[PDB]
Amino acid sequence: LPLNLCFAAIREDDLLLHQLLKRGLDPNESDNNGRTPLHIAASKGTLNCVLLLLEYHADPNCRDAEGSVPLWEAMVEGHEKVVKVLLEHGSTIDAGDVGHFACTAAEQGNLKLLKEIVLHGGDVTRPRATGTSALHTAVCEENIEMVKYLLEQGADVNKQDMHGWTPRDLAEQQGHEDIKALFRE
Ligand SMILES: [Mg+2]
Ligand SMILES: [Mg+2]
C-alpha cells in the first residue's frame, strides 16, 4: 500500500490528506484507471477532503477511464453538499461521458438522477459509444415513468445500438403494451 493521496481519501482521513498535501503530493496524479483523490473524496462525500483538494488545485473536471467526473461521483451517492461545492468551482456534468451516466441511472432505476443530469445541463438522450441509450435500458427495465421522461426529453426511438436494436424494437419483444402504446404517440 503506497502512502498517497488516494490512500487518505479512500479512508476519509482529511487530517492525513492535509498533511500529505502540505508535503507536496500532487492531487492531479491518478491511479492506473485515471482515478484521482478528488474522484474518491467526491464519491465518499467527504467535504473537508474535497475542499482541501480543490485548494491544492485538484482539477474539478478530471475524467477517469470510464469517463466519470467528480461531480457525477457525488451525484450518484447523493452527496448534495459536495455537488454544490463542485459546481461552485466550475465542475460541469458535460465534462464527463453523459451518455454513460444516463445509461447507468437507467440501469439503477434512478429517475431522480436522470433529472439531475438534466438539471445540470446534461443531454440524457446521448448514447454510450456502444449505441445503447438510457431509453433502450428503460424499455428493458420496463420502467414506465422513466420511458415517459426520456421520451419527453426527446429520446431517439429509432436509435440502433451496436446490435441493431432500437428502443421501439425492444418494446415489442417484451410485450409491455403500456410501453408500446407510448411509442405510438
Ligand atoms: Mg474527517
Ligand atoms: Mg496553491
From Swiss-Prot:
Top-level taxonomic group: Eukaryota
Localisation per UniProt entry: Cell membrane
Induction summary: In roots, strongly reduced after 2,4-dichlorophenoxyacetic acid (2,4-D) treatment and weakly reduced after benzyladenine (BA) treatment. In shoots, strongly reduced after abscisic acid (ABA) treatment and induced after benzyladenine (BA) treatment.
ANK repeat windows: 1-29, 33-62, 66-95, 97-126, 130-159, 163-185
Post-translational modification: Phosphorylated by CIPK proteins CIPK6, CIPK16 and CIPK23. The activation by phosphorylation is induced by low K(+) conditions and stimulates K(+) uptake and relocation. Dephosphorylation by AIP1 repressed the transport activity.
Tissue localization of expression: Preferentially expressed in the peripheral cell layers of root mature including root cortex and root hairs. Detected also, at a lower level, in the mesophyll of the leaves and at restricted sites corresponding to hydathodes and guard cells.
Domain notes: The segment S4 is probably the voltage-sensor and is characterized by a series of positively charged amino acids. The pore-forming region H5 is enclosed by the transmembrane segments S5 and S6 in the Shaker-type (1P/6TM) and contains the GYGD signature motif which seems to be involved in potassium selectivity. The KHA domain (rich in hydrophobic and acidic residues) present in the C-terminal part is likely to be important for tetramerization.
Biological role: Highly selective inward-rectifying potassium channel that mediate potassium uptake by plant roots in response to low K(+) conditions, by a calcium-, CBL-, and CIPK-dependent pathway. Positively regulated by phosphorylation by CIPK23. Negatively regulated by a kinase-independent regulatory mechanism involving a competing direct binding of CBL10. Involved in the stomatal regulation by monitoring the turgor pressure in guard cells. Assuming opened or closed conformations in response to the voltage difference across the membrane, the channel is activated by hyperpolarization.
Family statement: Belongs to the potassium channel family. Plant (TC 1.A.1.4) subfamily.
Quaternary data: The potassium channel is probably composed of a homo- or heterotetrameric complex of pore-forming subunits. Possible heteromultimer with AKT2 or KAT3. Part of a K(+)-channel calcium-sensing kinase/phosphatase complex composed by a calcium sensor CBL (CBL1, CBL2, CBL3 or CBL9), a kinase CIPK (CIPK6, CIPK16 or CIPK23), a phosphatase PP2C (AIP1) and a K(+)-channel (AKT1). Interacts directly with AIP1, CBL10, CIPK6, CIPK16 and CIPK23.
Listed name of the protein: Potassium channel AKT1
Source organism: Arabidopsis thaliana (Mouse-ear cress)
Gene (name only): AKT1
